[PDB]
Ligand binder design. Structure first.
Ligand SMILES: [Ca+2]
Ligand SMILES: [Ca+2]
Length: 108
C-alpha cells in the first residue's frame, strides 16, 4: 500500500467507487482520492511503484495493473481503460508512461 502520498480512506473510497471494469477513468480517480492535490513530485513516488520492469516507464503490460496499485489484488484494465489512461498521460505515442508525463495527467 502506498500510504506515502494519499490517504487510505481516500483510496478505499476511490477504489470501490469504480472498482468495476470499464467503469472508472484516468481523470476520475483524483476527485475521490486526491492525486491532483499532490505536487508533481509526490505523484512521481507512485510511478516508481507501477514500474514492474524498473526500465523507467509504465508500459501497457504494467498499466493494466492500475487497480493493483491501490488495491493490490483487484482486476486489470481493458482495451477501453489502459488505452485511455495511456492516451491521457503518455500523449507521446510510445505506449509507456513516464515520470514526466504522469503528473501532467493528474493535476492537468
Ligand atoms: Ca516498466
Ligand atoms: Ca511516454
Amino acid at each position: 500500500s502506498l500510504t506515502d502520498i494519499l490517504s487510505p480512506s481516500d483510496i478505499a473510497a476511490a477504489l470501490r467507487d469504480c472498482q468495476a471494469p470499464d467503469s472508472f477513468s484516468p481523470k476520475k480517480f483524483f476527485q475521490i482520492s486526491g492525486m491532483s492535490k499532490k505536487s508533481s513530485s509526490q505523484l512521481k513516488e507512485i510511478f516508481r511503484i507501477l514500474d514492474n520492469d524498473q526500465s523507467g516507464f509504465i508500459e501497457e503490460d504494467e498499466l493494466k495493473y492500475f487497480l493493483q496499485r491501490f488495491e493490490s489484488g483487484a482486476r486489470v484494465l481493458t482495451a477501453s481503460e489502459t488505452k485511455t489512461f495511456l492516451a491521457a498521460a503518455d500523449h507521446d505515442g510510445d505506449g509507456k508512461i513516464g515520470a514526466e508525463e504522469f503528473q501532467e495527467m493528474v493535476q492537468s
